Ligand binder design. Structure first.
Ligand SMILES: Nc1ncnc2c1ncn2[C@@H]1O[C@H](COP(=O)(O)OP(=O)(O)NP(=O)(O)O)[C@@H](O)[C@H]1O
Ligand SMILES: Nc1ncnc2c1ncn2[C@@H]1O[C@H](COP(=O)(O)OP(=O)(O)NP(=O)(O)O)[C@@H](O)[C@H]1O
Ligand SMILES: [Mg+2]
Ligand SMILES: [Mg+2]
Lengths: 578, 584
């Protein structure tokens, strides 16, 4: 139940669009009720002839009534479609936009554990389900009931109470058989959807690892592992479509038994002198015009049922994946002095394995602090917690003495600029990626960042320059070039706090020192936290934080830590060993 | 087109199965259904026996039995035969869809590295889905919607010829010709809008998927609304195109209805006039009524059938264009296998660039000796990973050649060449599975002993042991739940499980502390005897103890020699090593 979302629609002229559309339907249905009465002009072709002329009433009245009735029915249906198409496309678009936004609202844990193909299939299928569900609720529930009741009333009036009882019995057995077969088919369809999602997810995962498959020559292995899920889906789909065919034959059996009974009773009434032969075609046309909407209601029920289950699936994917949230009436972060404080932070990604065991440190405002440690000590975890992708179990994190968990995430992330360990670029040009740092960045800012990131000369020597396409995830650039593009993005952003998580690992020391010296020259009060395994990158830092066993082991300058003969001294001795 | 003549050799292996029986049965079912549909109004035309020869006990027997037997049972048998065709053909159809999807996936993995580097994942996904669906529906309509419609059309024409002379048949063929004409005209009117619409849909989905891949980036720069707007733009463009297309379809439907109902009025008016002259009966009225409805019901879909066949043909031609253009490396005719007796590597005057407007390798020549441990260093952009990609033959050089044990890489099967190489790439990507599956991926059917030995060699065995789920820990998409060093060590473990004669580490230990790195390297040097090891690294301490160091600068080999030799020459490597020992 997500009701209030469509209510803004009446702000527009959608009223005028929907009412007329509904109006069209009604008029079309009206002609469909005046179509068999139009066909009892054959009575005037046999019984009593014509009041004025026997063949003139029949010819003229019949051509006009039957032809215009069928044409006007189709015309009103298509007029409804034509006038409602704009509203329908706008509704589908708004649903897709809101789904996309809610998908970007989800937590980092979800996107790290996601499967892109599965998410794609689930989103597509659920959006189609919701769209068709709303369409059927607007155009296939009230008109069908109207036709059903109207045709029942006409049979009541012109044929007593036998035809209506037979018709309601047929309709009730129809809805019962439909429910039974649909409930039988729900399991197969659910399994089929799940298998299709898994198959598409596996295919997309194989696409993401194309270079891996090439590196290990496992093309046939991936082909077979996709064919497995493909064949499972094929079996499930065969079962489901056979179920649908059986439902169709049962529905046809019921409707045609009603047909035989009705026309037999009508001709028996004729043979008893009660009814006319025109009543035969009367009941014929009315039963066909009643068989169309019941065939519509069967698929309407099936579609609403599976649309509800697919909607539940998609929402279950977009529901419970929001860990970090703003506290009620959260204020904005005020960065007067860009300091960072880790106050006894205890954190782990999952409760069964703890990574940070009460970590505490103080990055002074405007300082240039480094973070070292072995692989797995939890440095990138510090980076992720500072950006509040997760909340710590115990302790807290402060920026200028303010708890990040008690401030709006927007203001917190506006004060931070992160160059991640895994740098990912948009499948666009270098200019777009570098300008992405700030919305509406000027060419001057882009050039300044490219010069500060030591890629201005690289971009200048490129045949397409700033318009060079970087490919998916920027893999068409070299590693150092991608890292420098990320640095240029964060420089365009220009926040008070900067965090380089292994930002220059793919750079030669010369280019790295160019970037760092340019930053130290042009920056005045920027705080710069840097993580690196290459100790030469951070030797000239103001302070170095040695992380060990999820805690802070040592802290101090390069010379102090070397003289203290501690853990950092061992690192630098083993790395500076000739 | 000739694409269908070129595509047909693949539906030729399909002919060898029992699916001959299933398709024959399906066609038979169709034919029986059409026969019953034709016979339906023949005996609904026993309303004549109701009025004419009527008013007694015998007429009521003729009529009751006549309609009960023929009309009700006939329409039921028609629907039953339609669904019987569906049920007997469902297996063949699903198998055809599955085989098409498998072949599309295989060909997609057959394309060149350039394509996948420049690809758009969401666009590729949407295009593959739409094209496979279109080809499937095209084949389905060619098999089940061409012969039955022609049969019904000609049969109803013959029946009208017999029971109504030659005026009705001429009117009917005129209506049919104006119907197909209007359909073609409107379809070609909307085709451009449909192509633009499909293109916009693909672009929008590609943009959304790219935003998904950059979730962390969007979060880092707070551009959620920016991505929302950049997706909404293409979404509403697609919406406008779709509105235009569906309105075109609505006009097509009203025009078809106009034609059909004009023919209806004319035919039934002529029938009642013939009745008024004593020529025809009221049964002829109901006759022509049911026959005209049963004749224009299949045409109500051939309009879309033409659209579907056209778009399926163009998508098939697009597929053939994509496979005739996006495979740049191929095996020479009767290519032999690579015989690596002595794992040496040779770059003989290699001139290469990715695009012709920018050359990266300017006549590079070097000799990696068999069993040696050579390093490749240089500034960012010199073309070291380019050397790595050329050695694996992702691209072919413009000039020069590459040799492994004296054999030209371009004159050997790619499978044997790539089997002799094991590379840890600069961009390590893992499958969205467990650590055990990723490490075991190095060799098909690797044993637990090999996986454990490789995890020990990559210095990650202890880490996996201390994990709550051990080898079954999920690494996430692209292995982003592991750390950088852990992911690199998993990649090293993969290449160690593979255990080829030649190994290439392109920045393989950059995210590792020097201790773990030296553990891995010492373990390798201990267990390896005659393995050739090419290593690329900016951190020179990783490669200082190499047998030879190759300095690459702007695509040319500048210096060459041991660590001591290059340090003593006071050249570029000496400058790099002095600047890297910063002692600040
Ligand atoms: N999302 C996650 N789920 C589970 N475990 C995780 C997740 N992210 C990180 N880890 C683990 O947490 C530990 C610390 O990771 P991380 O903070 O990246 O350390 P790191 O040392 O700074 N990166 P590195 O230099 O490459 O070793 C490692 O054992 C990771 O495998
Ligand atoms: N597919 C491609 N299309 C265009 N340019 C490319 C492509 N691949 C690589 N390049 C360029 O080729 C040059 C060198 O690429 P690369 O082989 O990665 O050198 P590299 O030595 O590995 N750089 P790095 O790893 O950062 O130290 C760079 O200018 C790249 O941008
Ligand atoms: Mg890290
Ligand atoms: Mg590289």
């Amino acid at each position: 139940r997500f009701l209030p979302y469509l209510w803004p629609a009446d702000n527009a002229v959608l009223r005028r669009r929907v009412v007329g559309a509904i109006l069209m339907v009604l008029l079309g249905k009206a002609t469909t009720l005046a179509l068999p009465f139009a066909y009892k002009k054959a009575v005037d072709a046999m019984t009593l002839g014509g009041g004025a002329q026997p063949a003139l009433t029949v010819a003229l009245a019949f051509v006009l009534a039957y032809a215009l009735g069928r044409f006007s029915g189709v015309l009103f249906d298509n007029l409804r479609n034509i006038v409602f198409e704009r509203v329908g496309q706008d509704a589908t678009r708004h649903l897709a936009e809101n789904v996309f936004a809610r998908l970007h609202k989800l937590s980092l844990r979800f996107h790290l554990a996601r499967r892109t193909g599965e998410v794609t299939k689930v989103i597509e299928r659920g959006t189609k389900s919701i769209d068709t569900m709303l369409y059927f609720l607007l155009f296939n529930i009230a008109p069908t009931v109207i036709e059903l009741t109207a045709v029942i009333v006409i049979f009541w009036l012109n044929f007593g109470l036998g035809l209506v009882t037979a018709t309601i019995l047929a309709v009730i057995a129809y809805v019962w058989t439909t429910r039974t077969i649909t409930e039988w088919r729900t399991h197969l369809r659910e399994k089929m959807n799940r298998l299709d999602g898994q198959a598409l997810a596996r295919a997309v995962d194989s696409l993401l690892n194309y270079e891996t498959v090439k590196y290990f020559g496992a093309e046939s292995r991936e082909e077979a592992r996709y064919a497995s899920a493909a064949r499972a889906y094929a079996d499930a789909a065969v079962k489901s479509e056979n179920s649908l065919g059986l439902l169709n034959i049962a529905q046809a059996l019921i409707v045609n038994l009603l047909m035989a009974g009705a026309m037999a009773w009508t001709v028996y009434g004729w043979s008893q002198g009660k009814l006319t032969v025109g009543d035969l075609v009367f009941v014929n046309t009315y039963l066909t015009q009643l068989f169309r909407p019941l065939d519509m209601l069967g698929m309407v029920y099936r579609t609403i049922r599976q649309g509800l289950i697919d909607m539940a699936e998609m929402f279950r994917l977009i529901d419970t994946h929001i860990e970090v949230a703003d506290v009620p009436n959260a204020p904005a972060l005020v960065v007067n002095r860009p300091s960072v404080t880790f106050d006894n932070v205890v954190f782990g990604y999952d409760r069964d394995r703890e990574i940070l065991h009460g970590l505490s440190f103080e990055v002074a405002a405007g300082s240039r602090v480094a973070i070292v440690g072995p692989s797995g000590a939890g440095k990138s975890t510090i980076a992720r917690l500072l950006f509040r992708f997760y909340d710590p179990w115990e302790g807290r994190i402060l920026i200028d003495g303010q708890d990040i968990a008690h401030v709006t995430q927007t203001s917190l992330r506006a004060a931070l600029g992160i160059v991640p360990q895994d740098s990912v670029l948009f499948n666009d040009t270098i200019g777009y990626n570098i300008a992405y740092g700030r919305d509406g960045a000027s060419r001057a800012e882009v050039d300044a960042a490219a010069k500060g990131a030591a890629i201005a000369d690289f971009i200048a020597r490129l045949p397409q320059g700033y318009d060079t396409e970087v490919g998916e995830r920027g893999l068409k650039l070299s590693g150092g070039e991608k890292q420098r593009v990320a640095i240029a993005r964060t420089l365009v952003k220009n926040p008070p706090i900067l965090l380089f998580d292994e930002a220059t690992s793919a750079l030669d020391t010369r280019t790295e020192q160019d970037i760092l010296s340019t930053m130290r020259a042009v920056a005045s009060h920027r705080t710069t936290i840097s993580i690196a395994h290459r100790l030469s990158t951070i030797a000239d830092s103001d302070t170095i934080l040695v992380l060990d066993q999820g805690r802070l082991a040592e802290q101090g300058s390069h010379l102090d830590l070397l003289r203290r003969d501690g853990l950092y001294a061992e690192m630098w001795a083993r790395q500076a060993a000739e």
